[PDB]
């Protein structure tokens, strides 16, 4: 039924949700795939064509949501060749009834006849719309007797069916009969063939599977299912003006309606068996090929750092070698400015390994990799290592506050003589698989020196450990979690809780002194002519 508009034709269609442009077409074009069309939501454009007749025998309605030259819903011009003697001679618009918005323009079609005969005011609604029909067809045949002067062609079957519809007062202006019994529904654009939503020729707003409706089936509804906002399973999306259950062609559902691609601040997600645009949140996913192995870069240096801006996945590994940090005079790569390392604060996943053998001495924490959540380890370093932290004598805390999974590989943390807080760390939580002979943690600042100088996990960190001092560096919280901060209370009584996480409660959850304020967050959890 539906088809986005502009040689063959995927136009065995009835409505073109767009413009119909016919340009630079020769005489030998199968324009028969258009016969079925009977609504054009944009304009119709016919220019630079050599074919003799334009078959659109079923077209009745041209909406003109978009108009050509800001004036015309139909535009027909220069459809002739002088050398060839091929030219347009007829517009087969026998059945054309209503041009909702826009005018008509037919000029400079040397062999096109009879366009001057018809009455355009019977069709165009906007009477202030411009209508130009000139300089297209002299030495033209006169019209048939049966047509009585109004025709889309020489024959007697090519007459404009100009049948006056004197609708009744009660009828708001569109009717399928003469008396007040036969008023078209209010949602009908033009007339109708009956008094229902289904009987309209064209819809004033939206078409839901034949029924002309004011709004496509909305996403949330007070369906009384809970007497509140519910997911009417019967939900539909706008393909411009036709309600569809599933966006056809190759579209995506951005909120209420179909679109050709998600907007800038959103991304595609596989949801409800459909592709939906969900808001990007922090930042849209951006993968960026990594270093080492199949990469052309053996380390990150002053040439690669700016290639990792706004990256969420690394699609590979990350290497921080002293040749990249301090520069390379045999390659003439300059040294790296430590601030640029902040580029990695957006990284949440690394497909292969992470290798750190050098780091700016002032940086006492790899907190630039705080939001790292997963190290895949599908590519590995040295003797099968997914995480390697070596020879860092100015670092004092790991700082991987958001690391939760190392999908595969071995772990090596050795010779970071000033590093603490890693002793108490349940790696069995983070590393996937048996931690058997897979940990190589040696020669960091000994436990005793760390505890003596005060370097220990915050009391609210659970036995899982921590990635540094403070409550925000814990692996797991002993009691409850106020965001990234392990928190000791939860404000439940004197703020609800779920899965040992402290959250705020929905509006209208009456604050109650000494008792539960929320029992959960929501309209259904909080503890129109109303009272």
């Amino acid at each position, epitope marked *: 039924a539906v088809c986005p508009g502009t040689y063959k034709l995927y136009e065995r269609c009835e409505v073109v949700m767009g413009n119909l442009e016919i340009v630079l077409t020769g005489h030998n074009a199968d324009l028969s795939f258009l016969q079925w069309i009977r609504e054009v939501t944009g304009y119709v454009l016919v220019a630079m064509n050599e074919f003799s007749t334009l078959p659109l025998p079923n077209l009745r309605v041209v909406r003109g949501t978009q108009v050509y030259d800001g004036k015309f819903a139909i535009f027909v011009m220069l459809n002739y060749n002088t050398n060839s003697s091929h030219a347009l001679r007829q517009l087969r618009l026998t059945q054309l009834t209503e041009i909702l918005s826009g005018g008509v323009y037919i000029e400079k079609n040397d062999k096109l006849c009879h366009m001057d005969t018809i009455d355009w005011r019977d069709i165009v609604r906007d009477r202030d719309a411009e209508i130009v029909v000139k300089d297209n067809g002299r030495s033209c045949p006169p019209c048939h007797e049966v047509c009585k002067g109004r025709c889309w062609g020489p024959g007697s079957e090519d007459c404009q069916t100009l*049948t006056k519809t004197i609708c009744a007062p*009660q009828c708001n202006g569109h009717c399928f*009969g003469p008396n007040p*019994n036969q008023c078209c529904h209010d949602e009908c654009a033009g007339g109708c063939s009956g008094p229902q939503d289904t009987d309209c020729f064209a819809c004033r707003h939206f078409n839901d599977s034949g029924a002309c409706v004011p709004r496509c089936p909305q996403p949330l509804v007070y369906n009384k299912l809970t007497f509140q906002l519910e997911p009417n399973p019967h939900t539909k999306y706008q393909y411009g003006g036709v309600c569809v259950a599933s966006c056809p062609h190759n579209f995506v559902v951005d909120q209420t309606s179909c679109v050709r691609a998600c907007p800038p601040d959103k991304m595609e997600v596989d949801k409800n068996g459909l592709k939906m645009c969900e808001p990007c949140g922090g930042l849209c996913p951006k993968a960026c090929e990594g270093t080492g192995s199949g990469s052309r870069f053996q380390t990150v240096d002053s040439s690669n750092i700016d290639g990792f801006v706004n990256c969420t996945k690394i699609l590979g590994n990350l290497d921080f070698l002293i040749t990249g940090l301090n520069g390379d005079p045999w390659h003439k790569i300059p040294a790296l400015d430590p601030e640029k390392l902040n580029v990695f604060r957006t990284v949440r996943e690394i497909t292969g390994y992470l290798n750190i053998q050098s780091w700016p001495p002032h940086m006492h924490n790899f907190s630039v990799f705080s939001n790292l959540t997963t190290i895949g380890g599908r590519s590995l370093y040295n003797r099968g290592f997914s995480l390697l932290i070596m020879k860092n004598l100015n670092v004092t805390s790991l700082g991987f506050r958001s690391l939760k999974e190392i999908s595969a590989g071995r772990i090596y943390i050795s010779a970071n003589r000033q590093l603490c807080y890693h002793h108490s760390l349940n790696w069995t939580k983070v590393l996937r698989g048996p931690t058997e002979e897979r940990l190589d943690i040696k020669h960091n600042r000994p436990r005793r020196d760390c505890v003596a100088e005060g370097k220990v996990c915050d009391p609210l960190c659970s036995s899982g450990g921590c990635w540094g001092p403070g409550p925000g560096q814990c692996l797991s919280c002993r009691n409850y979690s106020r965001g990234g901060v392990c928190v000791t209370h939860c404000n439940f009584l004197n703020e609800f809780a779920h899965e040992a996480e402290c959250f705020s409660c929905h509006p209208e959850c009456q604050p109650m002194e000494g008792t539960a304020t929320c029992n959960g967050s929501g309209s259904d959890t909080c503890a129109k002519y109303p009272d």
Partner: antibody
Amino acid sequence: QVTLRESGPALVKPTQTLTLTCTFSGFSLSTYGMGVGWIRQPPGKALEWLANIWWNDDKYYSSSLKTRLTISKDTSKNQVVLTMTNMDPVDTATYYCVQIANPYWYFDVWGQGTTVTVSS
Amino acid sequence: DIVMTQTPLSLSVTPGQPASISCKSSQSLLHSYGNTYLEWYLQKPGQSPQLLIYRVSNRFSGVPDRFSGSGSGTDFTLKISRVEAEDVGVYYCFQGSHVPFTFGQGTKLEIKR
């Protein structure tokens, strides 16, 4: 059961004014979509649509007889009245009143028809 | 305004044989696209006319299957497949599309015993 009855004088002198009354039951001319019509048939000749009145008080008439016809309604009495002026022997006919309920058809329920003869 | 003309002015059919009656109009009975209010009525001897077909081709509630209606514009046709003894009477065509509603002159269908 929709039933309609036509009543009126069986004899009318020329140039006088005939007044017919269609009384009906089984429906009301106050419901949206209802109309009552008047159709006459001269004896042995063809039907001729005369007039139609609707729940809107909207009135439509035959053109040739527009000046002489006048149709009226009273839902409280379930009655429709027709008035024809300047009665000529040609107007001698059987006058039927009819119901129009559906917008897809006309003249579904007919009365038996009252016979009006114009003569001095 | 609209002149209606029924073509078989008289008709005599043996029971079981078909029948055809035609209504030609002076102007097209098209009010709006897909809206042609041509109706066929039957008046049996000494009765009120019954509606047989509305909108050219739609049998009214109760009309038996043998009554059919075709047509468009100014030309329409009623067809009785198997004329029965009950079908005798006068058939009228009627237009409801234009201001002066008009009937056909009538078509007397007789029975050929």
